[PDB]
Design a protein around this nucleic acid. Structure first.
Lengths: 98, 207, 11, 100, 82, 126, 153
RNA sequence: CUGGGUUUGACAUGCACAGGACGCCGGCAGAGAUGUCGGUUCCCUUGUGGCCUGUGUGCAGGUGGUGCAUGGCUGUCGUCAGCUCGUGUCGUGAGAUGUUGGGUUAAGUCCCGCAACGAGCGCAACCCUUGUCUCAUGUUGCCAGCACGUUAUGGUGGGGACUCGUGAGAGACUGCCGGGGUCAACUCGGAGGAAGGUGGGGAUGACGUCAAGUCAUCAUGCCCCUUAUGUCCAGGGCUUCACACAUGCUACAAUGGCCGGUACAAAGGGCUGCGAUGCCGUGAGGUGGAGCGAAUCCUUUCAAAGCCGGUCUCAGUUCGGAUCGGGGUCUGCAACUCGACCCCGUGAAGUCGGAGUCGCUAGUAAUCGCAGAUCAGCAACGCUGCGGUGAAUACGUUCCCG
């Protein structure tokens, strides 16, 4: 039985750091990993009017970009799992364990 | 509308976000509680120069870091100030909220503090030329400052006619993306109205 | 008659 | 906008959670199936007796601080005027100007 | 128009008012504010003072106007010409 | 084997070239069931014509993205690349014909304040 | 065109006729980008012409083009604060363009119930020298001649 | 707007007197606000704290006035190339010079001259996207070579090969060649290359101008209201119509209408949301709920123009769909004023539009569809994006505008 690890963060550098750190600890515990499989970046776009009043033709665009990484391991020995609940990560990156 | 906000121009390049967390279902209420925290801290503390407030969140625990030029003023020796801020941050439905009070290394190289000082001087009695000259000289005396521009506008000197005045020293390349421009805006309270002070400080570039 | 049409619609 | 109207919006929300949660929803479940005997039940009439403020149809997404009733964004709960100002100041995580 | 499954819509106020009005077989002028209530065959004789925005205008129901709404007989906007 | 790609404004074509007859297999359909437009067929076969190697290569292609015109252009570029991989010493012939150049012409982005990429709203002076 | 001439688009030769002129014709009849319909119309008209006369369609198309190709045209010129209709010589490319545009338009206002039929009839009469495009060339040459006094500037 | 209520108020915080209730839960009256009735009643700990009551009292509260008192934010000249300063010099002085002259550039870009020598904000670059390639990379994405498949397909075991997704990097620098050039800037042509001369498109908007716009996002000086210009409620209005102006959509048809078959996209959205198979309707839709926080499921497997076939035969028509009659669906407390959609019927003007005027230089105009935000529903033909098909023309600056 294998379990999926899903990473989502707004910053590419932080999510890469989390991915490599997770790979390092799981290979410390003696596990086989599939590697940080990249996933499509989610883009949410918003367009707003600059001025408080009228002046509709002047607009400003914003996005919110989410980067996704996929970690898949095998041979879930209890030591690896226990190490998994014992990892400190930046508040920016969230971890989904399935 | 002439110049976009310098922080937002370099948000993904040079400057960094002041709030660090991830939320998908709870983005809206996170934003609400963040703005509530910010306005509470802005109203409560005005004496010590509050240069910046960062908020970090992780599930139940909330971490708020603030930078001030007078940390002793905002902190209680027995924790009285700490007690008050802790309790009224719990009341903000923040669950577990913890505070890391910090101090800025060079208050005169920080744009927000410079604008705060200039506006405070402007409020009571000081002529604006004196304030701008003093701020510019004090900032240029610092080692890393390569250029500072100070601009304030309004009913300067209690006049009936609004005016805009600015002095610059050195290099302030607002159009250059890699150049880090520290931007600070703060409004001066006078008996004749409200005077806005904007400060741009340029200290090299980050590559 | 309209009353009949009401009876058809709702009754 | 106006303090009274900002408050009244919240009062509608607490009314909605108190009433629309089960009272103004079981009556709808009664009316849905034609098999269900609605006509004698007066689930329509009973649900009329409920206050109008129970209905979410009376709600209005206002800016969470500003009270601005128009130009609202559901992701942030903020007006277009406020979103622009806080995104520029780097207050909303993972938001920046666009180019493509 | 309203869907047939839900049935016609009449407010409880004037519904109760007309049930107590017709139980003793005399029709007095009934003062109402619910222009959204449709006309039921129980209204055939009763005279309604439906609201208009400024005042209440007398509406005497007949067989024909069944199924319509009381507001159709209280014109709101007044126009005479330019 | 050898495999190249051709891209033309959101159309991607993968090609697999083998030395068989002139059979055109486009995702399991022939050059007639596919591309029922003579101009498109000529656009497809032009690299073969200038290289004079028509009817001596079985062609298998994967098509995805864009419309028929973009698919045809990407397929032509893919065939030119495959030919340059098979017989290198024909490069001047194809290159001077331009078949080796990816066309960098994409849909221009729509701009705010304008109805289209360049079309501007009608403005009345009076 | 303030800073100098702009490059021309090198449109390709047609596959089923091998001539530049037919591609120019299809691009002239093209509407809304429906290129396939334009090609169908032009090919149908050429085949109708070939059936009616019995010979190659490109040769008669060229004959019609030469019959409707102008040589002298009139442009308004402002010299010394005064405007006049000055006859001007036409370059070969502009003459081909004008001839094709005239052919396509005057076929568009024919009465043959279908654009392919209208185009075929127009090109045939232009080959024989009876089209309305031939007439239009006649009036443009007449107008150029009647204003010859102004050719000196 | 009409009418019905209320005043330390709909909402805050402080000073006082009395308390254990505030608060809910149902009944009745009322259009509702509200009023009344029936049931439930604080934890501290002896000083009183949280709740409100009234009585109050400071006070709250104004989308009330003045954008000619203001801050902030924004438009505009204009992404135009310009706007200034220190020292020196000239002038009684306002001022001038630099910044002018020759050449050159998209550019106050650069070179050569020069009573000027330098500097700053602008220009350019640094950022994003897009076009080529290399390394890494295999799931939910690919499937070339192998096996299992049943028609229903990467569907399934398997595999990095080819796409693709996302990290790093290379790559365009007049780098090279030939010719003009002051041997200077710069310019023309050629080779190589995916790309050649700021490659394409974005973001970025100098000093200022127009007392430009905004006290109705917000904040704010001063003035004003305060039993009301605050505040609650029902109904109405913002949708009124003899007209005028402006931006659009649909047409006036055969390069077309209708019917049947059939092929190719990108981007984006989805938890009390997307919602499939199936079944019932003719159709909006109804029932039902598989699977999906989603490169997986749903938006159908995604399109329309396109292609093929049939019919219509130049008519106010098989064009056009307005208006109107009847019948329904859905959302919603509720579609009368005043929603969208569906069905049957009805079938108006309109025959390519005067003077005049607008946009657009290439993946552009024209045309075709798709998606998103706001949003219970929608007035969306609007706005912001995405892809499909894809032209003509530029001789040249005399005239019009800046």
């Amino acid at each position: 039985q294998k379990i999926r690890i899903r990473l989502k963060a707004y910053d590419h550098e932080a999510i890469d750091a989390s991915a490599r750190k997770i790979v390092e600890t799981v290979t410390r515990t003696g596990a086989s990993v599939v590697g940080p499989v990249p996933l499509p970046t989610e883009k949410n776009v918003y367009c707003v009017i600059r001025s408080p009043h009228k002046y509709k033709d002047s607009r400003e665009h914003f996005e919110m970009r989410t980067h996704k990484r996929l970690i898949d391991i095998l041979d879930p020995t209890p030591k690896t799992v226990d190490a998994l609940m014992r990892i400190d990560l930046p508040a920016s990156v969230d971890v989904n364990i399935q | 509308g002439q110049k976009i906000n310098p922080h937002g121009f370099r948000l993904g390049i040079t400057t960094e976000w002041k709030s660090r967390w991830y939320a998908d279902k709870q983005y809206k209420d996170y934003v609400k509680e963040d703005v509530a925290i910010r306005k509470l801290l802005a109203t409560g503390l005005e004496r010590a120069g509050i240069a910046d407030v960062e908020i970090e969140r992780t599930r139940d625990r909330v971490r708020v870091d603030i930078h001030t030029a007078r940390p002793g003023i905002v902190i209680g020796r027995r924790g009285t100030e700490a007690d008050r801020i802790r309790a009224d941050l719990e009341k903000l439905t923040g669950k577990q909220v913890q505070l890391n009070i910090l101090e800025v290394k060079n208050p005169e190289s920080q744009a927000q503090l410079v604008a705060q000082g200039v506006a405070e001087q402007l409020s009571n009695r000081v002529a604006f030329r004196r304030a701008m000259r003093k701020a510019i000289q004090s900032a240029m005396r610092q080692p890393n400052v390569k250029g500072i521009r100070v601009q304030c506008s309004g009913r300067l000197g209690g006049a009936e006619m609004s005016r805009s005045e600015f002095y610059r020293e050195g290099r302030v390349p607002l159009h250059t993306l890699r150049a880090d421009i520290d931007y600070g805006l703060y409004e001066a309270k006078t008996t004749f109205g409200r005077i806005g002070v904007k400060v741009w400080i340029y200290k090299g570039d980050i590559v | 008659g309209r009353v009949a049409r009401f009876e058809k619609r709702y009754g | 906008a106006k303090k009274s109207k900002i408050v009244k919006n919240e009062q509608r929300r607490e009314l909605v959670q108190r009433y629309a949660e089960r009272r103004a929803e079981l009556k709808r479940t009664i009316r849905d199936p034609a098999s269900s005997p609605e006509r004698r039940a007066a689930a329509v009439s009973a649900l009329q007796r409920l206050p109008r403020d129970s209905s979410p149809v009376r709600l209005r997404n206002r800016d969470v601080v500003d009270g601005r009733p128009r130009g609202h964004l559901r992701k942030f709960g903020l007006s277009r005027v406020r979103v622009r100002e806080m995104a520029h100041r780097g207050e909303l995580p993972g938001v920046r100007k666009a180019s493509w | 128009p309203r869907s047939l499954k839900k049935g016609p819509f009449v407010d409880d106020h004037l519904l109760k008012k007309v049930d107590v009005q017709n139980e003793k077989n005399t029709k007095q002028v009934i003062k109402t504010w619910s222009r959204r209530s449709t006309i039921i065959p129980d209204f055939i004789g009763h005279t309604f003072a439906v609201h208009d925005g400024r005042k209440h205008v007398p509406v005497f129901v007949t067989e024909a106007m069944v199924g319509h709404k009381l507001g159709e007989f209280a014109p709101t906007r007044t126009f005479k010409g330019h | 084997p050898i495999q190249t790609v051709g891209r033309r404004k959101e159309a991607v074509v993968r090609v697999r070239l083998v030395p068989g007859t002139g059979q055109f297999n486009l995702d399991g359909r022939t050059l007639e069931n596919y591309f029922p437009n003579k101009v498109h067929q000529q656009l497809i076969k032009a690299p073969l014509v200038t290289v004079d190697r028509v009817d001596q290569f079985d062609i298998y292609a994967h098509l995805d993205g864009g419309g028929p015109s973009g698919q045809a252009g990407a397929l032509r570029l893919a065939i030119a690349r495959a030919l340059i991989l098979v017989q290198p010493e024909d490069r001047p012939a194809l290159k001077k014909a331009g078949f080796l150049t990816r066309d960098p012409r994409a849909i221009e982005r729509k701009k705010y304040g304008l109805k289209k990429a360049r079309k501007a709203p009608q403005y009345s002076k009076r | 065109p303030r800073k100098g001439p702009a490059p021309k688009r090198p449109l390709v030769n047609d596959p089923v006729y091998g001539s530049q002129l037919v591609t120019q014709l299809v691009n002239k009849v093209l509407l809304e980008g429906k290129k396939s319909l334009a090609e169908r119309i032009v090919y149908g008209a050429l085949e109708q012409a070939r059936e009616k006369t019995g010979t190659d369609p490109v040769v008669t198309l060229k004959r019609a083009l030469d019959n409707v190709k102008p040589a002298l045209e009139v442009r308004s010129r402002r010299v010394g604060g005064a405007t006049y209709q000055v006859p001007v010589e036409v370059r070969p490319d502009r003459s081909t363009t004008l001839a094709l545009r005239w052919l396509v338009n005057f076929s568009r206002q024919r009465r043959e119930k279908t654009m392919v039929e209208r185009l075929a009839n127009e090109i045939l009469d232009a080959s024989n020298g009876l089209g309305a495009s031939v007439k239009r060339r006649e009036d443009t040459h007449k107008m150029a001649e009647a204003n010859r006094a102004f050719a000196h500037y």
